[PDB]
């Protein structure tokens, strides 16, 4: 997705949140 860490940077369980500065 867009920005799935947007909204939520704590956690990335999802590809979707992977990229975003929570996980990366």
Same mark, same amino acid.
């Given at each position: @997705?867009? &920005? +799935? +860490? &947007? !909204?939520? !940077? %704590? @956690?990335? /369980?999802? /590809?979707? +949140?992977? %990229?975003?500065? =929570? =996980?990366?």
């Amino acid at each position: @997705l867009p &920005s +799935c +860490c &947007s !909204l939520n !940077l %704590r @956690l990335c /369980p999802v /590809p979707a +949140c992977k %990229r975003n500065p =929570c =996980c990366t």
